[PDB]
Design an enzyme around this catalytic site. Structure first.
Site, short mmCIF file in Angstrom:
data_model
loop_
_atom_site.label_atom_id
_atom_site.label_comp_id
_atom_site.label_asym_id
_atom_site.label_seq_id
_atom_site.Cartn_x
_atom_site.Cartn_y
_atom_site.Cartn_z
N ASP A 1 0.98 -1.10 0.01
CA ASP A 1 0.06 0.05 0.04
C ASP A 1 0.75 1.35 -0.17
O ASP A 1 1.64 1.38 1.11
CB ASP A 1 -1.17 -0.02 1.30
N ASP B 1 -3.23 2.27 -5.79
CA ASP B 1 -1.75 2.57 -4.64
C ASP B 1 -1.84 1.08 -3.73
O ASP B 1 -1.29 1.24 -3.24
CB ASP B 1 -1.49 3.44 -3.95
N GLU B 2 -2.74 0.21 -4.74
CA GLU B 2 -2.92 -1.33 -3.48
C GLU B 2 -2.43 -2.91 -4.31
O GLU B 2 -2.59 -2.68 -5.27
CB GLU B 2 -4.12 -1.19 -2.82
N1 LIG Z 1 -11.96 9.02 -0.72
C1 LIG Z 1 -10.54 8.80 -0.61
C2 LIG Z 1 -9.31 8.12 -0.32
C3 LIG Z 1 -8.81 7.84 -1.39
N2 LIG Z 1 -8.60 8.69 -2.88
C4 LIG Z 1 -7.11 7.42 -3.65
C5 LIG Z 1 -5.85 9.09 -3.44
C6 LIG Z 1 -4.97 8.57 -3.36
C7 LIG Z 1 -5.29 7.36 -3.55
C8 LIG Z 1 -3.44 6.18 -2.46
O1 LIG Z 1 -4.44 7.55 -0.79
P1 LIG Z 1 -3.15 7.51 0.43
O2 LIG Z 1 -2.44 6.51 -0.27
O3 LIG Z 1 -3.72 8.89 0.69
O4 LIG Z 1 -4.08 7.23 1.77
P2 LIG Z 1 -3.45 6.01 2.87
O5 LIG Z 1 -3.48 4.88 2.86
O6 LIG Z 1 -5.00 6.05 3.78
O7 LIG Z 1 -2.73 7.48 3.13
O8 LIG Z 1 -6.13 6.59 -2.88
C9 LIG Z 1 -9.27 9.10 -2.92
O9 LIG Z 1 -9.35 9.73 -4.34
N3 LIG Z 1 -10.43 9.58 -2.72
CA LIG Z 2 -1.76 4.24 0.49
#
Ligand SMILES: Nc1ccn([C@H]2CC[C@@H](COP(=O)(O)OP(=O)(O)O)O2)c(=O)n1
Ligand SMILES: [Ca+2]
Ligand SMILES: [Mg+2]
EC number: 2.7.7.7
Length: 341
Positions: A7, A105-106
């Site tokens: 992630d 991103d996962e």
């Molecule tokens: N409500 C959302 C939620 C996430 N996202 C998207 C944006 C980026 C991608 C990865 O998010 P992050 O790595 O910041 O999340 P994290 O791992 O919780 O820190 O998901 C979006 O567009 N709207």
């Molecule tokens: Ca993430």
DNA sequence: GGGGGAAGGACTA
DNA sequence: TCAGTAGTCCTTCCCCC
């Protein structure tokens, strides 16, 4: 079975920091500007410095600026993030044949045939983090466990820039102590339904009649939670295949005028076909978000592929259908193509 | 009762 | 004038074996 979940940390914001290192140390907020007015829109994500102040994905950009007026506000550059992501995903492919790209991103990797135990799994995790850091200078969190659900839970517990193994004994502990709301697939609505049944932990799903649980949350989620609670969940890692591609935009002003809405709709189709690239859809759906934020859609499946010209003509008919069957004004309009040949 | 198919929902990113 | 955008899977509902 051993599953390794990757992630990327605060991905969009992290990519902007890598492309512009002068931003490191400062709160960075990546935004989705709608265009209806100055700063209208929502936050896609923010780095951890901004999150310390309460700025999180989903909140209005204005709300964020009220809390952190001097943070760095950047417009989302999805195309950039997608290219970085694909490169990182390609690095992961070298560590396992069985890989499931869940989203931008996962990704889940089945490494049960690559490592002997969790000791080695942990080491592969460190190697994966170092490789991504070396090649793309991006930090990621790795979650490791006996199945996909707990691998993800592990990552949630360790982010950012972490690595966590949840062994068999900890899974048992989590089944009894983990709040069921933190289990993937359980949102606020489902969490409240469960609350009414007195279910707050996975183990609790083993103290109620299946019939009563299925009647509250449906058979799919009921079997899901029970399999997890019984520690029998073992869903395989499957290669992900895109099932749909679309685009939805916010209009300058709410409308019910077909000629005023069409340009936004056609723009969404053009962008959708750009993204389809080679894939030919047999189904098209026009999706509208009304003034009160309700979501309405009308689609059609053809026995053949849909040419761009057919998409134009059919989208207009589907939109007319929406306007004829719903009286509310439209705020956002878009399209989604699926059922690829 | 449930297969099929369209549309509404819920959830994750 | 707080309220984005992308994608997946399940439920609900209606026609009809
Ligand atoms: N409500 C959302 C939620 C996430 N996202 C998207 C944006 C980026 C991608 C990865 O998010 P992050 O790595 O910041 O999340 P994290 O791992 O919780 O820190 O998901 C979006 O567009 N709207
Ligand atoms: Ca993430
Ligand atoms: Mg939840």
């Amino acid at each position: 079975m051993i599953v390794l979940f990757v992630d990327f940390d605060y991905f969009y914001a992290q990519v902007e920091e890598v492309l512009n290192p002068s931003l490191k140390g400062k709160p960075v907020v990546v935004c989705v500007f709608s265009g209806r007015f100055e700063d209208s829109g929502a936050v896609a994500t923010a780095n951890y410095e901004a999150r310390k102040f309460g700025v999180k994905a989903g909140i209005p950009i204005v709300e964020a600026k009220k809390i952190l007026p001097n943070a760095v506000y950047l417009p989302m550059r999805k195309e950039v993030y997608q290219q970085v992501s694909s490169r990182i995903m390609n690095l992961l492919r070298e560590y396992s044949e069985k890989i499931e790209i869940a989203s931008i991103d996962e990704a889940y990797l089945d490494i049960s045939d690559k490592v002997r135990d969790y000791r080695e799994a942990y080491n592969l995790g460190l190697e994966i983090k170092n490789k991504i850091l070396e090649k793309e200078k991006i930090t990621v969190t790795v979650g490791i466990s006996k199945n996909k659900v707990f691998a993800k839970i592990a990552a949630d517990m360790a982010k950012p820039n972490g690595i966590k193994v949840i062994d068999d004994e900890e899974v048992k502990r989590l089944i009894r102590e983990l709040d069921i709301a933190d289990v993937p697939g359980i949102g606020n609505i489902t969490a409240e339904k469960l609350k009414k049944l007195g279910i707050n932990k996975l183990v609790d799903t083993l103290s109620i009649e299946f019939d009563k649980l299925k009647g509250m949350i449906g058979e799919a989620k009921a079997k899901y939670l029970i399999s997890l609670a019984r520690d029998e969940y073992n869903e395989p890692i499957r290669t992900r295949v895109r099932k749909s591609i679309g685009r939805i935009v916010t209009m300058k002003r709410n409308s019910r005028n077909l000629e005023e809405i069409k340009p936004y709709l056609f723009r969404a189709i053009e962008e959708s076909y750009y993204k389809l690239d080679k894939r030919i859809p047999k189904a098209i759906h026009v999706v509208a978000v009304t003034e009160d934020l309700d979501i309405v859609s009308r689609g059609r499946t053809f026995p053949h592929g849909i040419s761009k010209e057919t998409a134009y003509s059919e989208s207009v008919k589907l939109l007319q259908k929406i306007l004829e069957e719903d009286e509310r004004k439209i705020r956002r309009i878009g399209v989604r193509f699926s059922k690829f040949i």
